[PDB]
C-alpha cells in the first residue's frame, strides 16, 4: 500500500521529468557540458553547441532562457501532479490553486539537482553556466539566482535521490494551507498520506539518516520563504524593467503573492 504509493509517485516522476538528479550527477561528475562563463562562450553556445522574445541585451537574454526552462518545468510538474490519482480527483480549480502556489517551490527544490557550488546545467545538460557569469550580469538579474544556489548547496548535503524527490515534490504541491483552496480537508488528507509515504520511504532508503524526515519538513518551510523573496524580485523587475518580457503564465502565478 504505502510502498505501492511510493512506487506510483516515483514512476510518475520518472515519466514526466526529462532531467533527473541521476542523469545530472552523471554529467556533473564526468562519466562533457560546454561551459558558458562569459559573453564569448554564451554566444558560442547559442550558435549550435547548446541551442524567445526579441533580443534586448545579454542579461535579459539569460533571463529569457531561464524563463523558458521554468515554464517548461511548470508543464512537467502539472503533468506530474495530474498523474497522482488523488490529485486528479480534486476540482480543476483546486488543482490550479495547488500548482499556482506550489510550482516554484518544487522548481527550486529540483533546481538543486542540476546545481553545484560553481554553476548549473542548461539545455538538457549539454551546457553548464558558471555561477561567476550569473553573478556578473546587470542588476537586478544577477540577484535572482544567488539565493537559489545557497539553498541548493545545503539541500544537496542531504544527498537525496530521485525516489526521495518524487515524494518530496508531491508533498510540496499537495499543501493544505494554500490561499483560496475549496476542499482544505481533502488536500490535507492527501498530503498526510504522501508525508507518511515519505518518512516510510526514507526509513528504508536512508537507514543511517539522522533526522532526515524532520529536516525535509524544515526544507519545505525554507522553500516557501525562498519563493516569497523570489516573487518580490519578479514584481520589482515588472516595475523597473518594463522592457523585459514576462511570461503571462508566470505573471498569473505571481499575481496575488
Ligand atoms: O519568473 C520566473 O520564475 C521565471 C524566471 C526564473 C529565473 C530567471 C533568471 C535570470 C537570471 Cl540572470 C538568473 C536566475 C533566474 N531565474 S531562477 O533562479 O528562478 C532559475 C534559473 C535557472 C533554472 N533551470 C531550471 S529551473 C531554473 C530557475
Residue numbers in the entry: 174 to 204, 209 to 228, 235 to 440
The authors write:
PPARs belong to the nuclear receptor superfamily and the ligand-activated transcription factors; they exist in three subtypes in mammals (namely, PPARα, PPARβ/δ, and PPARγ) with considerable amino acid identity (54–71% in humans). The ligand-bound activated forms of PPARs are stabilized by associations with specific coactivators, thereby enabling the regulation of specific gene expression. The carboxylic groups of the PPAR ligands are known to stabilize the AF-2 helix 12 through hydrogen bonds (red dotted lines) and electrostatic interactions (blue dotted lines) with the four surrounding consensus amino acids: Ser280/Tyr314/His440/Tyr464 in PPARα-LBD, Thr253/His287/His413/Tyr437 in PPARδ-LBD, and Ser289/His323/His449/Tyr473 in PPARγ-LBD.
Obtained structures were identical to previously reported active conformations that form the Activation Function-2 (AF-2) helix 12, thereby providing root mean square distances of 0.60 Å (226 common Cα positions in PPARα/δ) and 0.53 Å (212 common Cα positions in PPARα/γ). In PPARδ-LBP, lanifibranor was located in the “Center,” and seladelpar was located in the “Center” and the “Arm II” regions. The “so-called” PPAR pan agonist lanifibranor indeed activated all PPAR subtypes with EC50 values of 398 nM (for δ) < 572 nM (for γ) < 4.66 µM (for α), and equivalent efficacies (13.3% of the maximal responses for α/δ and 24.9% for γ). Lanifibranor recruited both PGC1α and SRC1 to all PPARα/δ/γ-LBD structures with equivalent potencies but altered efficacies: γ > δ > α in the case of PGC1α and α ~ δ ~ γ in the case of SRC1. Lanifibranor increased the Tm values in all PPARα/δ/γ-LBD complexes, with the highest values being evident in PPARγ-LBD (61.4%), which is similar to its effect upon the PGC1α recruitment. Our structure seems more reasonable because the interaction of the carboxylic groups of lanifibranor with the four consensus amino acids contributes to the stabilization of the AF-2 helix 12 so as to facilitate the recruitment of coactivators in all PPAR subtypes.
